[model samples]
Structure formats: structure tokens, C-alpha cells
Target: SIDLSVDTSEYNRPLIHFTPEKGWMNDPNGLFYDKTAKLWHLYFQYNPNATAWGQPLYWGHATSNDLVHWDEHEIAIGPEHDNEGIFSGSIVVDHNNTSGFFNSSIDPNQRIVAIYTNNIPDNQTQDIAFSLDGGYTFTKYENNPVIDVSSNQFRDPKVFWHEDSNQWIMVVSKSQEYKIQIFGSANLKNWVLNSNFSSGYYGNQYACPGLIEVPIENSDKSKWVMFLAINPGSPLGGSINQYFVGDFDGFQFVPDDSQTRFVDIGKDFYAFQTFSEVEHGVLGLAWASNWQYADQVPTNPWRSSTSLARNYTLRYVHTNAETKQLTLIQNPVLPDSINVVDKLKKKNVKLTNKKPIKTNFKGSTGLFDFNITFKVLNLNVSPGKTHFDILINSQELNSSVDSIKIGFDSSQSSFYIDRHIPNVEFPRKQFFTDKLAAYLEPLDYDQDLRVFSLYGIVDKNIIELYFNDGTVAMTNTFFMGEGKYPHDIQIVTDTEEPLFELESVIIRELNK
Candidate 1:
């Protein structure tokens, strides 16, 4: 009975239906992509029975053809009567008749307008619904509160349809000066007050407000792109998801320069949204968990998931001083559908000792994807001596003991990634303490600690890590012991070209 079966249908990656039995999901709401019916609509924020995460709240629906295998339907938009849930939104496809809510001459009932934000009982306006037999039943628009901030606490709306001022553009999420308040509606139901963007500090607010248009790889319509997400609290620089290469004027969004970037610095991304189905390209979806700690995590009866379903694109790089930084390239929307095995090649494997590099379980209940690439020429003694270890299984199982370290001093520059599985633990920190307190300030610090790349995903007891290239990411949920022995993946260097380098390595088996 300890076997537990575990196949995961070949783990093609891109998960989050809250498996482990389901309950508690967040953000990633109303993202759309339905060019006629190409398919790719994800609207999440569930909280079904698994408990913990304020009241009911529904709106879970999933469908994806390319964005990596999804297909979860039921509760497309629930909890109404003023909705104590269904809070984040954006989904447009009124195509032309604009907002008649469908009947554009019956092209399949045509409609799919769902601009949301409804949390009654004390008010939280901005609503509108439609789905003329396409998005699966929805009407709610008796002229519904369309855009009444009841005095400005507004909410997350995001609508879109601004063919250069043909009108219909909203951005909501004001919350008293945390930023994001650009409205303008000719008829989607009347709204005006355009302009207002400044989410500098203090909690940040301005949550989930995608403004899409993007298209400047070569330039033509001048320039556009204004995605957003703030909520910045807890220590500072925590809740992120920002980008503003702007210059829109359906009503204002200036900023094409002046600095304000970061699509993902880490901290499990956050409340990102964008799905006006930009034809079939500029896609986005974020809510991979991290509201500063997510209620404390650890509760996996069958499945309590999030993270996996990130497929953003907007590449155009050349920055060091050349200019051109649009970077926002997340991966794993479902790497080809999962079911890969042995295909590792991309040399530079030289780790003379520190123990732990286990990978040989053929199959007991498979699921593993690891790719490591490190470069730390040498951290050979001095300033905190040395610390770089990657542990997996010696004994500790659910008290998790997985690790990745880097600590040097000349002033301070530390790095840590730890996962002690059992339920998931992310302790041990120090990485870039405010960029090492602005260059170097307290203590004798040494330098030289570089790891250009590393990506690992071992499902079943979850263990995710993407470093450097991903800017840094870590997720660990442990439970491993049934082994046929062989389970170590260590890389510790004290000297000698500890110059680790292993560019490519792929291992897969997931989908169940």
C-alpha cells in the first residue's frame, strides 16, 4: 500500500487543478484565446472543499489545445447574487456588434464578453456578463453595475476593445492610489475617467490589470504593451508582475521609457492576466501562488496545486548598453505533452565531490525532469569559508533536506534554495540581500559564485527549481522513499575549475 501507484499520465508539466484532491487555487482569472474556437480559456480562483482560503468563490474552467493539456470544466462562473467570489476578470470577443452580447447574425451565437469584478455585500463594482450560448450560459447584465466604484475601491475589470479610440477600454483596480485607473467606454456600458498609473509603494494594490496591444518588435503603431499586477507587500518587492512599454491613447497610458519592468523576478509569479486572445500569440497566465506565503502551505490530501501553466512570450533582447529589453520568456505550458526519457547531452559535468547526484529509478512510479547547468569557477575558502550542497535522500524525507547554496563575502552575496519535502519548506535565505546592501557594507565577503542555469522538476512529491535563466525559482513538496537506491544529484565545489557547466539535460515521464 506504500506504492501509491502514481503515474501522472506521463507528466507533461503545466499543472494546477489543485490535485492531491483539489481545493484552494488563486488568481489566473478569465484569460481568453478563442479565435472563433481555437480554444484556450482558463479562468481560475477555485476553493472547492479542500478548505483554507476565505469562503466559496468559484470560476474554475479550463481548456487548452496548445498551451499544454488542460480540459477542466464545471463552475465556469459561480457564486452570484452579488458574488462573494468570482472577483477577477477579462474575456472579450464581442467582435463588432460590440456589446449587444451576441446576435451578430448568429455566427454560432457569437458573444463571450465577460468583464468582471463583483463582490457584493458592501460593494465592489465593475461587472458585465454575456455568453450567448458559447462560453456556456451567462447573462447577468440588467445594465449591471457596469462601473460604479461606489466611491473608488473599484476592482479588477480589464475589458478591451479600443481599436484606436473606437472606445471600450477599462483597467480598474484603483483601491485609492495604488494605481491603475484608466477607463473609457462608449457603450460597453458607459465609463470615462481615463489616466492614473502610479503604484509606487505601500502595499502596491493595482492588482490584475492587463492592457494588451503589444506589437513593436519592429514598430508600426508606435508601441504598446502595458501589463500590470502590484500588491507589493511583505518586506518589499514581493507581489510582482509588471511591464510597461507603453504609449496608448484610447484614453492614456504613456510611459514608453522611464523604467518599470519585471515580468518575473521570482516569488512564484502573481495574479497576472491577459487573454483578449490576441489573435494567437501574446499569451499570459500567472497565479502560480505567492501572496507572501500563501496561508502557510502544506495540505495535500490528494492535490492542492498551482504553478505550471506559464507561457508568456515577448522576446527582443540586446541589453548591456545596446538597449532593447522586452524579456518575459517563461516556459512550461506543457513541454510537448510529457513523456520523455533519457535525452541528456550538453556537457560540462565536473563535480569532484560533495556527494548527492541520484537518478536511476527507471520506474516505480515515475516522474522526473532535470536539467542542470552550473558555473562557479571556485568558491575555494574564505569569507564564510564555503557552502554549496545539493542533498536529496540520506534519511530525511518529509522534514525535507534538499539544498542548493552559494555564499560569498567581500560585502555579501548569498544564494540558497532548499526543499525539505514532506509538505514543502523554503527556508535558508541570503541571496542578493538588496543586491548585497548596495555593493558591500557589513563584513568580510568574497565573490565569484555563478550558476548560469539549472532546471528541475520531479513530480509526485513535487520539487521544482529554475535558476538563473529563470532569474530564480523554487518549489518543493517532498515525499520520496521506495527507491531502488540511486538518488543523488549533488554538485559541490571548493576549488579547481569547479566551473560546472552542463547546458542541456532532459528527462521526462509525466501525465496521469
Candidate 2:
């Protein structure tokens, strides 16, 4: 399945996310922070032979100092033999040389350890490796296959130092059974099957299992959130992420409720993995392409990439006047190193062009909304509740370009994404349909005028839309064929006399 030669100079790759310089790449394999060097190390599944996945995968590597800017490194680990290939795993800093692979015992690299699944035909097992040079490279432990089981479904071992337990804790999935197994380790070699979590939601076997202790905002409360990737379990019917807020007492995990929560409702995000030993808060990244049509995407030299790293925080909202519930809030991690230009404005908009208001980026070049880029499209329709439609158009775009709409249809009493215009090519056998839509829950309009907002991260061919700060979001790929990109941002009325107010319009243009 490896194509030796393919020219893809005009690939629509993001300037921020880690896309392989060459080869097929998937789920972020090993993400860790090496304290000694003060750098972030990122690894992923890779096949250097082509732009699509194939057998004999390797560990592609890179490093970042600020978590935004990256310096690509050489392949860290490749198939050491004919049947052995490295799969996804986690890394930990053994300050005390717990693995005993240390040359200069105190040197962090000597203490740096990576626990991952080593794959071979007919069997899968956990293995260990030690990197003594501050995570630059590693040497496989001679006593290979530290944790072995009889099943082929055992993979993706995410190991962390449990300060409360004062030992290492690993969360790996038993894929075929759709369950997760918690393992305890003393020397990173010997393991014990402590407990298995199977008393919850089940659709498909779990992969890429993860757990994090999150602090509830503005309160003395916190909760343990466990997440895993599952196939055939998504509301939209492909692959997606599921999370549970629970308790972990260094031994057993129990959820506050049995109902599962999703980290993202969008169809593109999957394989969520967080940074190891996050310094201030929890941060994560996911493979942005869905498994349904990953092999057929229109790109060359490289086919897929990870979503921009995002920051996750736990928040509490009142259901009624007295009931509070916990939910996870996410925001795209912005780059602090990039130079940017900020624009702000307030406009009273109407559906008719006859009105004094017209759609325009107050002060925006709208050119290549590069990395660290953001656009907060804000609107507050006054008069209690309003019925209107806003269309984002591009004059430069011809037939291939897609126009997007955010509006309320009285027919359905719900707001829907009119992707009818944002055309996508044969991304797959059944890539995309007419539109992706949903009803506005509880009808968030009890006031005089209805208010609506959308924050966007725009790149060359794709747009990440976060409506009301993840209240509802969608990831869309629009191949508008380079026609005037975003020529106008205008309003239209689907109602005879729609009542509303356009409080503000801000254009935070993207620049390098």
C-alpha cells in the first residue's frame, strides 16, 4: 500500500498541527513533558513509505518548548525486526531512575521511560524502553514484553505516576470486550490487574483509554474524568470520544453518574490524548480525520493531521436555580509566539441591505488565518427573539468554494448548519451528505431578541467552528476552489418581519 512517488506541493496543511513531513500518520502515540529539558515531546504512528497507513509502523517524533512551536526530530523508534512494531503508549520521567537504565543516574534522560504496546502477528503485549538523553532517543529493555496477556486486543498503555498511590498506574483497553483494565506496577515491569471497568456504556471496544484529575472552576471541588475512544458508539455513527466524571482512590474508579459524556460533538475529533504531567492544566490533541474515510482524503505526501492542541477545563453550571452539574469545557490552544492583528466593532444588522448595516470585516485582510488564529463572530439579536439568516460568502470563489449559513428556521424552530453550499469532493465512498444540522435545545430564546455567537479557527481549506464556546460545534472542510475567500458576511430574513439586534462584529484576522 506504499506509493513511493507522489507530488503534493499544494496540500492544504495547517501551519500549527503536526503533519508528517512525509508519510502516513495517525493517533498521537506518546505525549510527554520532559522536566529536565523543559520541552514537550510528541510522537505518533507513522509509515515513512507513503502518505497512507500501511504495515510496519514507526514512532514519528517532534518537540516543543511552548507547546505551540514544534521542532521535528528524527524517527524515534522503528520496527526493530520483521514482526515487531511500536504502537501508541505514554512516557514518564523517572527522577529516581526507576527503570535502572541510567548511565548518569541523575540525568533525566537516563530516567525517562516509555511504556507502549509492541505489536506482532497473532499477539499484542506491553513493552518498555529507556531514553537517557533527555528523551532524544531510547533503547529497548532487554527483558522485553514486560506485561503480557493472552488476548490480541491489549494495546495503548497510558502510564502515569500516581502521587496518591506513590506508584505507576496504567489504563489500557480490552478492545474486543469493550472494557478497560487498570494495571498497577511497582518497577514498571511487573504488573497486576487491579480492577476492570465494565459497569457502564458499551457499544464498541474501547481504545486509547485516558484518565485525568480535573479541578472544578471557582470551587474547592474536583473530579476524576476518564475518557476513551470508541467506534460504532458515536451519536453521528462513526468514531468519537466518550468521558465519565468519577472518583479514583488510587485503586478503584467509580463514576458520579452512569450516563456517558462526549468531549466533542463534532465528527472530526477522535483519539483524544492529554499531555503527561501537564504543568498548569490539562491539554490534549486528537487525530482530526475520521476513520470512515481517512484513506481517501484529497492530499498527497501526507494524508491526515491532528487537531490543534486544546486546553480542557471543568466547569459547573446550574441546571435549575439550585442544581449544579459538572461538564468539560474546551478551547483551542492559541500560539503565543505568533504576531497578530486584532479588530473589534459593533453593528446593528438587519436582513435587508437597505439598512445602514452591510456585512464586512470591520478591519480585516482575512488573509491566511495562520496558526494562533481566531475569529469571534458575535451577535445579539434584540427584541427578545429574532428570526434571521446570516450567510458567509466569498466573491473570489467560483463553483468549488462553499458558502456557510447560521440561521433559525421557524419551520423547525431550530438553528442548522447550511453546508448545502460548502461542497466537499469524494472524501470517501459516502463522504458527506446535504447538510449537518441539529435543533437548538430548549430554544435558548426567552428574552426579547435572540442572541447567537460563533468562534472560528480558519485555515486554508478547513474551518473549525465553536458555537457558543463549545455549547455546540462543528468541524467542516470547505474546498471552495480559491474563489474570493469570504467575500461578504451578510444577513437575510427568512421571516417576513424578523426582530433582532446585531450587537457586535469582531474580526481577529489570521497572520503569520
Candidate 3:
């Protein structure tokens, strides 16, 4: 018997709740570390007292010393001009005494410059703001509407300093063209158009472009990466943050290839932004919710907050001696700051066609994190006929029908994560589908081996799953009509892996 005496609550790290201040929030904006104050500052889009969507847009502020515990601050920046809300933008330090906005006594490198959009009722222009005092307050540039939108759809300006050319560059969304237009600013005010880059298909509009300079692992030269959230039409597919790697010559971004590769394959990650926090290193945070189902979520007293902060390091995949590929892997940023206790129940048992293993545990109304690993040794059922199933339910065994499933294909070595929360009868509300799923296609002809890892979060009516190192994800919302009950868990593997094994597992109760 695994020492069940171990307290799982110790692993439950207290989660930070959004400020009681109401309204809808999404997309973490202008996340930066204020060196002078020794605090981490985060800005996000907020709508206070909004009974409906897109009302009174403002910039919400919060600060933290350890990034785990956050304290809500005042509304740092808002639409003080002509009722226009402050939209998404980037913050920078005028390190070259380039912009005549602040005093010289403050190190140009220490000054905080914010480049944001002013969402005019007509939505035709981009605005700018500057904060010399470490982002506490801001003054609209005397020359308001710094960049006028040639098209009504132009927005989301991400500005960064280019050291190679000694110029400033900005990338903004061009929705109509479905591409990102790169612009150059010599004085941080006047702008000149640079060549634009796109993936060709309008399937991706390239919203919220975040540009950063990352050094290739074990290389002296660095590569410039641009991160964009591509919003596809409904029913087309889900939104994803994709990246383009190449060189930035101060005026334009040259794509290594026109192909758009996803930064995270998971479904819940969106609007990811990064900043040069450690001078040479980049850190990022993203909005971890789906716009497709945002309206349907239960109105909690608090609005939007950020997903976990992720620190990234760039690496090169050496496929051949002459060719290499660049990729970013998420590094644990708050693992030490957040409390996590391990109280996992491990069982290795054999299963027949009719037998489904059930694991029961008392569940709180708050958040829970579960890590499960499944290993296959053999398959009894014919190829394509045998797949595994995992389910979670409330106390009543009958309610077990409303559960999430992971369907695996031994032949293709691919898997799909799905949920059945359909609106059926008194006990059943609605059957939900997978938020995200991935399968390795073209499996090895003779190998019948595979491993799967699933991380899940249960918050109120929301069920978010991060799979295989947060690469692919799925989010589902159901109004558990039966209310809360102790969680009933089940894992059923159908295939006959002659040596089927349940190698290792851990389930940690989340602190909310």
C-alpha cells in the first residue's frame, strides 16, 4: 500500500484569483519586470462593470514579488481620450535617449515606454503612451494617434528595439490581408512601412504579434522570433499561437520559411506575449481560455487573470549536419514558489474486456491537478478495434457516464482526447468534445508501444486538459446539473498489450 498517510493538501498550491473587480478580462498585456521597484508588473485588458461584451475597455494592473502571489493595483492606463479604450501594446526602455519623453537622469535603459492601441469607436487608428516612472502612470503622446490605420482592421502593435539597425520596429495585425505588417520608427514617432510577411492563406490573421530576439543554443548569433495568434473562422478550427523565425534587419522580418508552426499545440493557450526581462533572456505569459466558449462560462465575481507564467529558452534541433530547426521549450518559472505535495495512488492490475478500473477520491469545489501515465504492452483486440477510455464522474456511479475519454489507435499510434457532456436528460446536461487532441500518424509497422500523459484542471464548470507537455489541449464547459460530488475515476484499456503496464501516476489536489 502506498503511504496514503501523506497529506495531498501540501501539494495543493493556493491559486491566485482575479481581483473582485468585475468585467471580462483576457490576454495578459505588457508583462514586465520593474527593476527600480523590484516588482513584476502585469497589464491586461479589462472591462469594469460591463454587463455586456466590449464595454469600457481599460488596462488592469497587478504586481507580484514572486510571480505566484499577485496584488491587484489601480487601473494603470485607460482611454482618457475621446472615449477610446487602451488596446494591446508593448513596453520598452528608451535606452538610446532616442525619444524625447523623459529626463536623462533616469537611465535611458531604465525608462519604461509603452506602445499601445487606442480603440477608437470607429477603430481606425493606433495610439501610444509613455511612462517614465516605471509604469505607474502614463501620459498620452502629444502627438496622439501615432500610427493611423490605413485599414479599419489594423491593431495589436508589438514594438521592440532593433540593435542591428539602431531602429525601432513594430508589427501590427492586418486582418483584411491576414498578415503582419512590419514598420520601422527612427524616432519612436514617425513610422515607415516595411515589407509584410504572411503564411499566404487567410486562414490565419496573425493577431497580437510579439517579437523577441533569442540566441540559438550554443551559437553566438541570435534569431528574431515573432509570435502571433492566428484566429480562424468558427468551425474552421481552434486559435493557435504560431511563430516565425528569421532575421530582423530593423525594417523588416525575413521568415525562415512561410510555414507557421504552433508555439503550443494545446487548445487553451492564446495571445502569448514575451519580453526581454533578463536582458538576454525572454519570458512569456498567455491568456489560457477559449474565446469560442467565453460567453458561456459562469459569471464568477472575479474576471480574467493570466495562465501560468512560462520562461523560455531557444534550442536548435540538429536533424542533419547542415540543417537545423529552432524551437522554444517552456521552463518551469514558479515551481518553487507554488506549493505542491505529492499524494498519488499507484495500482497495477490486469483488465479484461468487461473490467474497468475505478479510483475514487474526495474532491473539493475548487481546482485539482492530475497527472496520469498509461503504457501499452500488447493488444488483445484487432487493430483499430481496440482503444482505451478514461472517465471522471461525481459521487453517483450513474453520473459516471459524463466523463472524458482518451481514444488511442494502436495502428496509427495516434490518440484523441474527448468528453461526452451532451444535453440529454435530467441527469445528463450536455456532452462536450475534446478541446484539443493529437495523434502520431503513420505509426511504426511492427511496434505496439506508446506512452500518454494527461494534466487536467477542474474549475467550476470548466474542464481544461493539457497533454504531452502542454503541446495539445482541450477545454470543455458543462453545467454539472447533478452538482458537485466526490470524484469517481476510471481507466479502461481495451487492447491486449501482453505485457501491459501501469508504470507511474501522480494526482495532486490543486490549491485555489
Best by lDDT: 2
lDDT of each: 0.55, 0.67, 0.61
List TM-scores for all candidates, in order: 0.33, 0.85, 0.79
Counting clashing residue pairs in each candidate, in order, gives 35, 20, 22
Q: What is the lDDT of candidate 1?
A: 0.55
Candidate 3 lDDT, 286-330, residue by residue in tens: 765556554344334333445656656566543233565566645
What's the lDDT for candidate 3?
Answer: 0.61
What lDDT tens digits, residue by residue, belong to model 2 across residues 1-512?
A: 55546534243555566678777888797788767677788898888876677768888899887665777888888776756678888887776666677766456533778888888888889998877677778889889898888778899888888889877899988878877889987689888888888744566668888988877777777888898887755666677787898999777789988887677766677788998867877888887766777767666667777777777777764334356567776777677675455533455544433442334454433332311111112244443334455555555434443466655543344455565553445656474433665443221343533444556665544556655454444665544432334544555653333244455555445544
* Candidate 1 Cα outliers beyond 4 Å, as residue runs: 1-22, 28-44, 50-78, 81-169, 172-182, 185-225, 228-244, 248-270, 273-286, 289-375, 378-389, 392-497, 500-512
Cα lDDT tens digits, model 1, 283-386, are 56576545655544433322235556554555555333245465544555555655564433445566544422444444423344556554545534453434
Ranking by TM-score: 2, 3, 1
Error of 1 at 72 (Å): 26
Better of 1 and 2 by lDDT: 2
Best by TM-score: 2
